[PDB]
Amino acid sequence: QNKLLLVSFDGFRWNYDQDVDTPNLDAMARDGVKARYMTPAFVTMTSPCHFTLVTGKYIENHGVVHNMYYNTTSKVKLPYHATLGIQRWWDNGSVPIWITAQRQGLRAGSFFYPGGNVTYQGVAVTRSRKEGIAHNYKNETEWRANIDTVMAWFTEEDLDLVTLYFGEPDSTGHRYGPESPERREMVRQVDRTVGYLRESIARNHLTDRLNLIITSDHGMTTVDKRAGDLVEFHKFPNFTFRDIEFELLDYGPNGMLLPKEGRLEKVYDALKDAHPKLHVYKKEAFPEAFHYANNPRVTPLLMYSDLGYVIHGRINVQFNNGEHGFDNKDMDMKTIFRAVGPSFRAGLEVEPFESVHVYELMCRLLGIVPEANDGHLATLLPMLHTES
Ligand SMILES: *[C@@H]1O[C@H](CO[C@@H]2O[C@@H](C)[C@@H](O)[C@@H](O)[C@@H]2O)[C@@H](O[C@@H]2O[C@H](CO)[C@@H](O)[C@H](O)[C@H]2NC(C)=O)[C@H](O)[C@H]1NC(C)=O
Ligand SMILES: *[C@@H]1O[C@H](CO)[C@@H](O[C@@H]2O[C@H](CO)[C@@H](O)[C@H](O)[C@H]2NC(C)=O)[C@H](O)[C@H]1NC(C)=O
Ligand SMILES: *[C@@H]1O[C@H](CO)[C@@H](O[C@@H]2O[C@H](CO)[C@@H](O)[C@H](O)[C@H]2NC(C)=O)[C@H](O)[C@H]1NC(C)=O
Ligand SMILES: *[C@@H]1O[C@H](CO)[C@@H](O)[C@H](O)[C@H]1NC(C)=O
Ligand code: NA
Ligand SMILES: [Zn+2]
Ligand SMILES: [Zn+2]
């Protein structure tokens, strides 16, 4: 059997390599497989999309419906890092790939990967590392060290699967924007890390025994501040926050709302036409194609805004130049799928696919029985060599 290394670079847009010199990614395209682009799950958030990659399920089905743990009764809203340690958020009836693999005699590890630092139905990941609260995500010397550690897990601790997470270029994209020179310098750093990764695989004699997947969770688009028709809840005339019991706003282009008892119809009629670029739905009427709304955790009202626009609640508190979370049909939200290894063909480009199919692939690559999921293995199977 071959080992598996899945690497994710947060917020790597499908065409980030097109206006940057990416020698190592280009080589990996020659030596392996590439998707024209990969369509992420909706919502296009970090944690929900990452969990889809390791469960093969749409977001409504695995239950991680937001970067933030929230609780409508207690009114708690925990940011991304804190939520990485809330077990009940991730252990909601779906089983990520580490746990499935370990029940079938494999050893699996998570390095900074969302959902990998908690237990599922009482089981823990064989090896797990979680970053600090104020972690620095762009330190290249730290990147190379983490790869060294992951390599030791493969060789010294007889691990078969590792999921390794990097917080760039999402961080740099957010701060300076996806079209900035800073982003491109960060993509250049990523590309150097791809080469270090492949060189580290060869140095450890795993080139012919280890399959490598390099992907991401979503893309990134610019937020124009020059635009004037901002989505501001505090400027909706016939709407009042007096009708809201719980709210989740001021977080990119996705919002949720739980009105006080009996005021749901009042709030809805106020907001359904409030802004031509804010699409508000009753939970039942939210588009099925998104595969997002039908989860008990989602609130009776949810909404999303058009590309380039974020949702402002009581007061504007968002200043990022780039954002994600938008419609997964938007090209700017599309992301990458790259892979190389003994089981993978070479020089192959495939038409786009949804990220929900990565799970079935990884399970076939590990020779394990997949949990029931929303993907289909026939989608990505052309990527693999025919056996003899
Ligand atoms: C960038 O990161 C390197 C590496 O950080 C160290 O290794 C990590 C994997 C982790 O174990 C951290 O706790 C470590 O800090 C930093 O290099 C280290 O810097 C400190 C000085 O503050 C020193 O004690 C160590 O010897 C250094 N290690 C090496 C290999 O050089 C570096 O400081 C970081 N730089 C920035 C600007 O964040
Ligand atoms: C998944 O999480 C949801 C929400 O955190 C759980 O839903 C709650 O479940 C208990 C029943 O045990 C109720 O007391 C709450 O009122 C439920 N709230 C909602 C909004 O559904 C759900 O039980 C969890 N499921 C699993 C399998 O862990
Ligand atoms: C979450 O990650 C932490 C590391 O950030 C894991 O803790 C380490 O576990 C090993 C062995 O149990 C120890 O030698 C380290 O000293 C631990 N460090 C810290 C800071 O705890 C932890 O096991 C992970 N948790 C889960 C549930 O996987
Ligand atoms: C939210 O917190 C409440 C309030 O303490 C708690 O009783 C319950 O476990 C949680 N409820 C839901 C629906 O998550
Ligand atoms: Na390039
Ligand atoms: Zn992300
Ligand atoms: Zn982000």
SS in 3 state form for the chain? CCEEEEEEECCCECCCCCCCCCHHHHHHHHHCEEECCEECCCCCCHHHHHHHHHHCCCHHHHCCCCCCEEECCCCEEECHHHHCCCHHHHCCCCCCHHHHHHCCCCCEEEECCCCCCCCECCECCCEEECCCCCCCCCCHHHHHHHHHHHHHHHHCCCCCEEEEEECCCHHHHHHHCCCCHHHHHHHHHHHHHHHHHHHHHHHCCCCCCEEEEEECCCCCEECCCCCCCCEEHHHCCCCCHHHEEEEECCCCCEEEEEECCCCHHHHHHHHCCCCCCEEEEEHHHCCHHHCCCCCCCCCCEEEEECCCCCEECCCCCCCCCEECCCCCCCHHHCECEEEECCCECCCEEECCEEHHHHHHHHHHHHCCCCCCCCCCCCCCHHHECCCC
Cβ of 73 below 6 Å from ligand 4 = yes
β partners of residue 354: 39
Q: Which ligand is nearest to the CA of 283?
A: 2
Residue 228: Cβ within 10 Å count: 6
Cβ of 63 below 6 Å from ligand 2 = yes
Query: Any residues with CB less than 8 A from the CB of 156 and at least 6 apart, and which?
Result: none
Instruction: Name the pairing type of β-strands 353-354 and 69-71.
Output: unpaired
β partners of residue 38: 335, 353
Class of the CATH domain delimited by 1-220+325-388: alpha beta
Q: Provide the residue ranges of all domains of the chain, joining segments of one domain with +.
A: 1-220+325-388, 221-324
Peptide bond preceding 40: is omega within 30 degrees of 0, i.e. cis? no
Ligand 2, atom 17, lies closest to the CA of 296
Cα 268 to Cα 261: distance, rounded to the nearest angstrom: 13
Method of structure determination: X-ray
Give the pair of three-digit tokens for residue 78: 């925990």
Does 46 participate in catalysis according to the annotation?
Answer: yes
275 is in an annotated binding site: no
Total count of residues recorded for the chain: 388
Cβ of 149 below 6 Å from ligand 3 = no
344-368 burial by CB neighbour count: b if 16+ within 10 A, else e? Answer: bbeeeebeebbbbbbbbbbbbbbeb
Resolution (A): 2.6
β partners of residue 213: 6, 339
Cβ of 295 below 6 Å from ligand 2 = no
Q: Which ligand is nearest to the CA of 134?
A: 1
Taking the centre of ligand 1 as the mean of its atom positions, its distance from the CA of residue 145, in whole angstroms, is: 10
- Contact 37/351 with Cβ under 8 angstroms? no
10 is in an annotated binding site: yes
Ligand 2 atom nearest the C-alpha of 92 is: 28
The amino acid that residue 269 corresponds to is D
